[PDB]
């Protein structure tokens, strides 16, 4: 029933590497929880999906390798990037002298299958990083894998013609409803749209009810307000939607 | 088709709190990505599931509150636990004097729906923590929510009679096959069973093929080897399996 009859597993990595290999010294901490297809009745589709998941989580340079190898190389690269940069920096800050908490680094990459129905595979990537400073950054990314065309769906695969201005107004109208307000200013006073206009984003995901547009920190709100989701039901976009059978499959579910 | 027709969403929290509220000082960093049911055609089932997910991710003290409230209280508690303990400790280490990297703390809690088919809901919790030291700890926990009995499945809900000794031998036999070896000693020389016997764990998950027993770091291998999964197909346990309709539903899928 589901395209490629995909089965998944994950690779977990958790590494603490201290400067100078000394436990009393600052460390970098890496966490990987990577979901990837292990079995398929279409290995072409399996290789395609693995390439996109690896490219999105770790980078294009890692294409062609087994995920276990990718995660190993990625982990070594991160530790060596950290040590070769921060060890001479720490020795310098020490030569002058207490040194700061500017040397404790964290990077987390988690990915899992959010939805897998008929010709659609929704892959969610959670990313977080801290390199000293007041705070770090955290991001949620989505891939809407078209299991026929073996590529992620973009807005111009889901919408016909010139829809940017139209979708912008739908997004504003929906957020106004969610926050029980009747003005752009009322939303703006709550901080929505205070870092910029609520334009449609390529960071979205499909589900049985509609399209959820996912705004990461800074996109439309200040960092401190966190991410924000704006969901548009399919019923409100009927005439704007494309011919891709995934749209019909989502609407039917 | 799926019991309670459940719809899910998540609460994301990312907080950096520095000692003395000073960016130049060490910090604690908390990450929460909590999945919870938002909509159901059986609100009794929805409240039950929310209680278990909150209890498992944050603790029993948080039962009865909305997940947004829970995550807020949990975050404040973590920051205050950190500051009220480590601020006088840091002031003391400073009074003597450079101070260590013993003060950079990290805690991550992520949860998501792994499987939701008919009367079964498999909930995966990913936990990680670092409090200084050579390394931290990371754990993956599973809840096999029985959507009829409104509680997680335990081994004695899935197996009949005295199955511990039997399951132990199945687990050893399966790991031997996975690592292409014919002795307990051959596995032991690879480190498997070097921290203790491979007894059945309550940390398992059901899927269309069988039961995956999830061993966290230290359970049966040294920390450095990471977690290990041992999957037993339903075909190899046919006569040992109980009457719970979820077993039949998994076997049929
Ligand atoms: Cl180290
Ligand atoms: Cl702070």
Coordinates of N, CA, C and O and ligand atoms in Angstrom, one line a residue, chain A residues 134, chain B residues 15-23 26-27 79 83, ligand 2:
Chain A
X134 N 25.5 34.0 24.4 CA 24.3 34.1 25.2 C 23.4 32.9 25.1 O 22.9 32.4 26.0
Chain B
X15 N 16.2 26.8 25.9 CA 16.6 27.7 26.9 C 18.1 27.6 27.3 O 18.6 26.5 27.6
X16 N 18.8 28.8 27.3 CA 20.2 28.9 27.8 C 20.1 29.9 29.0 O 19.6 31.0 28.9
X17 N 20.5 29.4 30.1 CA 20.5 30.3 31.3 C 21.8 30.3 31.9 O 22.4 29.2 32.2
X18 N 22.5 31.4 32.0 CA 23.8 31.6 32.6 C 23.8 31.8 34.0 O 22.9 32.4 34.6
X19 N 24.9 31.3 34.7 CA 25.1 31.6 36.1 C 25.1 33.1 36.3 O 25.8 33.8 35.5
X20 N 24.4 33.6 37.3 CA 24.4 35.1 37.7 C 23.8 35.9 36.5 O 23.9 37.1 36.5
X21 N 23.1 35.2 35.6 CA 22.5 35.9 34.4 C 23.5 36.7 33.6 O 23.2 37.7 33.0
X22 N 24.8 36.2 33.6 CA 25.9 36.8 32.9 C 26.4 35.9 31.7 O 26.9 34.8 32.0
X23 N 26.3 36.4 30.5 CA 26.7 35.7 29.3 C 28.2 35.3 29.3 O 28.5 34.2 28.7
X26 N 29.5 30.4 32.8 CA 28.9 29.1 32.3 C 27.4 29.1 32.4 O 26.8 29.9 33.0
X27 N 26.8 28.2 31.5 CA 25.4 28.2 31.4 C 24.8 26.8 31.4 O 25.6 25.8 31.2
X79 N 16.4 25.4 35.4 CA 17.2 26.6 35.5 C 17.5 27.0 37.0 O 18.7 27.2 37.3
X83 N 21.1 27.1 38.8 CA 21.6 28.3 39.4 C 21.8 28.3 40.9 O 22.9 28.7 41.4
Ligands
LIG2 CL1 21.1 34.1 31.3

